[PDB]
Amino acid sequence: QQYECVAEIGEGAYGKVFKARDLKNGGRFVALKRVRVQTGEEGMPLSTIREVAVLRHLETFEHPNVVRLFDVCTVSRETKLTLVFEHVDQDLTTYLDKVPEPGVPTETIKDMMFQLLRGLDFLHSHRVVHRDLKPQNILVTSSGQIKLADFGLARIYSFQMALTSVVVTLWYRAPEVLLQSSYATPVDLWSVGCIFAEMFRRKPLFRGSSDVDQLGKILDVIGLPGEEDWPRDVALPRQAFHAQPIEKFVTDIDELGKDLLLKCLTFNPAKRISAYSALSHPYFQDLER
C-alpha cells in the first residue's frame, strides 16, 4: 500500500523482484519480492514459507553475510503476497560486469570468497542448506560486503529426509545433483567453487545445455573420477563418459587459490572441503581480515 515500485531488479520463477520506495523512511529502498498466490487450492506457496521460516529463525543471530528480511505484506483481495527485504546496491553478476579492466583485483575476489564462506559456515552450522547459490543470488554492497539471498529452496536438513529431484540453475549444480543422487551441504560448496572460479574470469565456468552436457563440461575440467568416487546408488555409469589444468580456464589463479577452487570442485562430495575448514585454508592466510 505504501510501496512505490521503482523498477525490477531481476525476476525469480514465481515472481519478479522490484526495487521500491516506502513512506516508512524518507526515500528508503527495500527489495520487494511479491509472489502471485493464485487461488488454486494449495494455500500459501511452500517456497515463500520455507524461506521466511528459515530467515526468520536465525535473524536473532544478525549474521553479517545473510540478507535481511524486513516484512511480509499480504492483500486478501487471487491474493498478492509481497515479501519485503533489504535492498543492496546490486547483485554479483551486475558487479562482475561494471568492473573496470582487467576485472576484479585478486585481493577483492579473496575478501568476498571469504565473506561468502562465512555465510555458509553459519548456515550449515545450524543444519541449513541454501540449495540455490549463484551470482544472481549474491548481493554486493557498495562498501564491499557480501549478502546471501533467495532462500526459496533453503531447508532444514535432517537425516533420512526425502529429496526433490531438482535445484541450482544448472551451471552451478553439483555432479551428485546432476546425477539424481542424494545431497547435502556439499552442494553449496560446489556452487561456491563455481562462483569462485567465476570471480576471476567474469563469466560462468560451466555453461551447459543439458544434464549430460553440463555433467560433461564439469568433468571436462576436474577429470573423470575413480570407480570409488562415483555413486553406486544410481543412474548413468562412470563409463557414461570417456584433467586439464584449472588455470587454463581461470585466467591466472594463485596456486593456493587454485588449490581451493579444486577442493570445492571435488567430484565425490564426502571429500569436498567444508565451508568451516575452508575459512582456515592457506588462501586466506593474509587478507585485511
Partner: protein
C-alpha cells in the same frame, strides 16, 4: 524419492552447541494452552492423535509431526480456539508443517476430505501465519537424534536403524501433554535411551551414555533418567481408542 545420507559438516562438529542454543530461544514462561478458555488439554491429546495418524499414514518425513505440534501450541498461545474449530486449526498446522519439512506436501484436499471448505482451511493457514509473524520453523526434539548419537560415540552403521525407531517413539511420545514441558534436547535423549533399551542394537547398556548425555545436555543424571521414563510412558499411553 532420494532420501538424505550423512553429511559430516551438518552432523559431526558443534551443531549440537547451536541446537542447544536455538532451543533456549523459545522461552517458556507460560503453561500449556494456558490462555485457551474453551478447549482443554484432553482436547489437545485427541487432536494430536489424529495429526500423528495423518503424518504417519501419509508417510511424511519424521520432522513434520513435531513441527506441526510446535506450530499448534505456539499459535494457541496467541489465538483462541473452539471445540468445533480444533480439527481445522490442527489440519492447518499439519499443512504448514509439512510444506516445510517434507518434499511432497500434504494438500488441502487431503485434509478437507478428512474432517470445512477448501477455502476455510486456507484462511486458517493464513490466520496462523500472520499470528506467528510467519516465524514458522523451530528446534524439534527430532532434530537431536544424530547429533547425540555422534556425540555419544554410537557407531554410524547403527544410526539408520537407531534413528528409525527413535524418531517413531518420540513422535508418539509428543502426543502426551506431560512431554510438552520438556525441552526438545531432553525429549530426544529419553527417546534414544528408550529405543536403545527395548531393542539391543549392539549398544552398551543404555545405562552408559547416561553420563555423556548429562555432561552434553548440562542436566544431571537423575534428570535424563526421569525423562527416559516419561517418554517411555507417553509412548505406551498412545491409544487410538480416544478418537
Amino acid at each position: 524419492n532420494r532420501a538424505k545420507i550423512d553429511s559430516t559438516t551438518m552432523k559431526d562438529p558443534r551443531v549440537l552447541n547451536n541446537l542447544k542454543l536455538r532451543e533456549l530461544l523459545l522461552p517458556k514462561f507460560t503453561s500449556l494452552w494456558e490462555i485457551q478458555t474453551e478447549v482443554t488439554v484432553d482436547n489437545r491429546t485427541i487432536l494430536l492423535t489424529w495429526m500423528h495418524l495423518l503424518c504417519e499414514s501419509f508417510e511424511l518425513d519424521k520432522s513434520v509431526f513435531p513441527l506441526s505440534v510446535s506450530i499448534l501450541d505456539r499459535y494457541l498461545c496467541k489465538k483462541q480456539g473452539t471445540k468445533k474449530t480444533l480439527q481445522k486449526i490442527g489440519a492447518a498446522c499439519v499443512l504448514i508443517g509439512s510444506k516445510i519439512r517434507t518434499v511432497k506436501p500434504m494438500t488441502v484436499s487431503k485434509l478437507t476430505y478428512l474432517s470445512f471448505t477448501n477455502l476455510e482451511l486456507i484462511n486458517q493457514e493464513k490466520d496462523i501465519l500472520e499470528a506467528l509473524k510467519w516465524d514458522t520453523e523451530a528446534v524439534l526434539a527430532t532434530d537431536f537424534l544424530i547429533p547425540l548419537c555422534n556425540a555419544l560415540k554410537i557407531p554410524e552403521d547403527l544410526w539408520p536403524q537407531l534413528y528409525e525407531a527413535a524418531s517413531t517413539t518420540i513422535c508418539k511420545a509428543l502426543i502426551q501433554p506431560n512431554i510438552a514441558l520438556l525441552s526438545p534436547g531432553l525429549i530426544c535423549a529419553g527417546g534414544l535411551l528408550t529405543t536403545i533399551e527395548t531393542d539391543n542394537t549392539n549398544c552398551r547398556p543404555w545405562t552408559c551414555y547416561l553420563e555423556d548425555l548429562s555432561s552434553i545436555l548440562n542436566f544431571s543424571t537423575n534428570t535424563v533418567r526421569t525423562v527416559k521414563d516419561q517418554v517411555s510412558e507417553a509412548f505406551s499411553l498412545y491409544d487410538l481408542e480416544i478418537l
